[PDB]
Design a protein around this ligand. Structure first.
Ligand SMILES: *[C@@H]1[C@@H](N)[C@H](CO)[C@@H](O)[C@H](O)[C@H]1O
Length: 779
């Protein structure tokens, strides 16, 4: 039995005393509240909150039976007897405690019909209601089509009632989403912080904006993160690494970054981890190697791990420095990993952080451009291991998160004018604020492994991680390449956040090591990825601004149709492309559940209209099915080998016209690709395009804002291609100057305006300078 006794307001926070102790409620924004039970006791701080100390001004009202604590949009309604808190946005009940706070236990009611996304990486179905699973980051080597527990869990859910609930607790725990008791959501942990955070929104985009406002917004990654990565487990030598960079050049595939797995520090998988320094028998001139790659516009990224083995060169030093987690006796804790006997660097301590950070600094001075942190679950984490702030089981799910923070802060301190690249397997809610770019681990080389990636990506995207991606082509096991699967995976790759084929090196992961047919298929697609950089980089910009994920679920298309939540087969890549990956062999056609409206075949320009019924498209080996939304502006630049050469002096923009879309907007975000302060300081060039489409006219208004940046082109040569253009436009005005529209020979003359009757495309070619430009087509 729990009941209200009294309350106090203190520095904008409500402190309630029950018969069981104190509860502290603080609004972290108008739409988000932190609820801390056992508020009187000492416990671990928040990990989920970007500004854990903030408490914005709320209003408090009291009645006989209730308190009401209310920000702008979110209200907490506190029933006195029995004690229970429930949460309202407007007057809509979002979530109600059942027995609430009970070794740490939170129980809430679930509503009938309520669908619950969440839990981070699981392969269970998009709606996790009916499931129970651990909150314990753990490897799932070789997974395919099912997992209740893998590398990067999140103690958070997103409901069809448009709230996000975070269990702000780092410890070994569990989530029971109406499994044991059909109407009960239960959150449990062995130890750690007894708090939860509730965030509300009026739409899924606004909920996500509100969530990232309080948990952290991802800083814009360097533009090179959107390029082509060469990766395998693993390049065995400098000569092999150099030969791979060379193979990209001689096979004419784009390449931005090469990634070195654990052989850079020793010739065997076992026994060297912790060396954190070059194996000179196999990498004899690594500074020359990295400099030579930089001359070709290619970055070098190295793997690191949490573990220092007793057989490694840095064991004695790590012990001397007190850098490793300890046992209860105060000795360094050593335990038997696959790699040999070793300890774990205590990133929660001053000593471990300073020691590890010094190593990163040194290697980064040598030329390393970015960092890969593998095994941060931590993959092995014995229970008696003691960290500076608590035991292994208490801190487990925040280890990777703190490791990202340490490395992020380090990289900002060393290179304040560059954007850190930090790729890691395990984190916590909020890790995106340290730039964490996660991948879905050691996926099997099976169609099932591919078929799960959209579900995983959407689940992580929705709760903060825009750059979630997979090892393209698959990672684990296999004896010979499954060519069709590989092709499908690298096709899908183009339309998901990071283009990083990677796998165990008994089968080649890089597209340049494939047969002639595979390359003929993939080469134009990897170039397409580069041609599309203005589209992808603009979605990245919007992710930094608002948390809007790059991949969006089909359910965003109609928020009143909760049945769409189950879809894990078609997704939006940015605003305009509906993508349906092919995830089994031999598929001859697909049924695409396109939202009602007008849609075009990206590859063939075919126009489809639908009032609700799915569209059936045939498949081919060369592409995967992609539809463009009517009203899309699709921006392209010419293909480059590396983003170091990126220019937008030449722009090509495809507008998909249909009378059903009388107003359309597009934007292109351009900056120097590298300045971490470009957004904050307005050192960018934001191009805007507006189309107004009426019965007799099609009008485009073009403009630029921002203060620009060094090297920004003043005038861009622009080709605007209008798809599904009326054959009845007779003239064009460009800023009031009338230009005749040619009706022949458009591909074969330097025409300023020409209509291609066979393709229904109207091409305009002009100069887009700094002043506003209006293009008016008239019947
Ligand atoms: C971690 C390890 N299992 C591999 C060896 O370092 C990597 O190649 C893999 O991508 C990671 O998940």
């Amino acid at each position: 039995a729990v009941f209200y006794k009294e309350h106090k307001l203190r520095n904008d926070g409500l402190v309630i005393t029950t018969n069981q102790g104190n509860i502290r409620l603080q609004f972290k924004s108008e739409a988000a509240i932190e609820v801390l039970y056992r508020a009187d006791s000492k416990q671990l701080p928040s990990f989920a909150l970007a500004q854990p100390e903030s408490a914005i001004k709320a209003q408090l009202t009291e009645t006989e039976n209730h308190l009401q604590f209310s920000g702008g949009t979110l209200t907490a309604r506190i029933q006195k007897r029995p004690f229970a808190i429930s949460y309202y946005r407007d007057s809509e009940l979002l979530l109600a405690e059942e027995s609430g706070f009970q070794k740490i236990n939170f129980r809430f009611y679930l509503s009938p019909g309520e669908k619950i996304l969440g839990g981070g990486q699981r392969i269970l179905g998009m709606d996790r209601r009916g499931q129970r699973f651990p909150l314990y980051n753990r490897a799932h080597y070789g997974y395919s089509d099912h997992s209740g527990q893998m590398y990067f869990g999140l103690p958070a859910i997103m409901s069809s009632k448009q709230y996000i609930l975070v269990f702000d607790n780092s410890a070994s725990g569990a989530m029971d989403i109406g499994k044991t008791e059909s109407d009960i959501l239960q959150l449990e942990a062995k130890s750690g912080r007894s708090a939860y955070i509730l965030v509300a929104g009026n739409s899924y985009p606004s909920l996500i904006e509100n969530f990232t406002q309080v948990t952290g917004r991802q800083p814009l990654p360097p533009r090179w993160a959107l390029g082509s990565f060469a990766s395998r487990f693993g390049y065995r030598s400098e000569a092999e690494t150099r030969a791979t960079v060379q193979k990209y050049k001689t096979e004419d595939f784009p390449l931005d970054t090469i990634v070195l797995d654990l052989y850079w520090f020793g010739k065997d998988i076992k026994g060297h981890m912790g060396n954190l320094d070059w194996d000179k028998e196999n990498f004899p001139t690594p500074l020359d190697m990295m400099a030579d790659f930089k001359q070709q516009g290619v970055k070098t990224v190295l793997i690191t791990e949490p573990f220092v083995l007793t057989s490694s060169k840095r064991w004695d030093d790590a012990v001397k420095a007190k850098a490793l987690a300890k046992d209860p006796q105060g000795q360094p804790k050593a335990f038997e990993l696959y790699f040999g006997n070793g300890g774990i660097i205590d990133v929660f301590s001053k000593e471990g952080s300073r020691w590890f950070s010094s190593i990163y600094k040194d290697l980064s001075k040598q030329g390393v451009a970015g960092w890969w942190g593998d095994l941060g679950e931590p993959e092995m984490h014995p229970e008696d291991t003691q960290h500076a702030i608590g035991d292994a089981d208490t801190v487990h799910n925040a280890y990777g998160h703190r490791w990202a923070e340490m490395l992020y802060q380090q990289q900002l301190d060393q290179f304040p004018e560059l954007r850190p690249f930090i790729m890691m397997r395990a984190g916590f809610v909020g890790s995106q604020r340290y730039g964490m770019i996660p991948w879905t681990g050691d996926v099997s080389r099976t169609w099932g492994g591919l078929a799960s990636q959209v579900e995983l990506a959407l689940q992580m995207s929705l709760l903060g991680f825009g750059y979630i991606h997979s090892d393209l082509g698959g990672f684990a096991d296999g004896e010979t390449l499954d060519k069709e699967m590989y092709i499908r995976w690298l096709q899908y790759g183009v339309f998901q956040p990071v283009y990083r084929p990677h796998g165990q090196d008994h089968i080649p992961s890089e597209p340049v090591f494939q047969d002639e047919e595979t390359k003929a298929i993939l080469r134009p697609l990897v170039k397409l990825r580069y041609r599309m950089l203005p589209y992808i980089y603009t979605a990245a910009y919007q992710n930094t601004l608002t948390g809007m994920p790059l991949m969006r679920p089909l359910f965003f298309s109609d928020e009143k149709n909760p049945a769409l939540i189950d879809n894990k087969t078609s997704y939006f890549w940015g605003d305009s492309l509906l993508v349906t990956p092919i995830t089994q062999a031999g598929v001859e056609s697909v049924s695409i559940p396109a939202p009602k409206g007008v849609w075009f075949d990206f590859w063939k320009d075919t126009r489809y209209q639908t009032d609700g019924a799915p569209l059936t498209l045939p498949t081919d080996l060369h592409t995967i099915p992609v539809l463009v939304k009517a009203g899309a502006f699709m921006p392209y630049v010419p293909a480059v080998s590396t983003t170091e050469d990126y220019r937008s002096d030449s722009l090509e923009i495809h507008y998909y016209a249909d009378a059903s879309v009388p107003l359309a907007q597009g934007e292109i975000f351009e900056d120097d690709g590298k300045d971490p302060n470009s957004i904050k300081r307005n050192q960018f060039d934001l191009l805007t395009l507006q189309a107004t489409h009426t019965d007799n006219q099609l009008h485009f208004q073009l403009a630029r804002t921002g203060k620009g940046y060094r090297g920004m082109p003043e005038r861009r040569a622009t080709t605007l291609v209008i798809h599904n253009a009326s054959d009845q436009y007779q003239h064009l005005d460009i800023n009031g100057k009338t230009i005749a529209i040619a009706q022949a020979d458009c591909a074969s003359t330097p025409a300023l305006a020409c209509y291609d009757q066979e393709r229904r495309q109207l091409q305009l070619v002009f100069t887009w300078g700094r002043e506003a430009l209006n293009l008016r087509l008239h019947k």
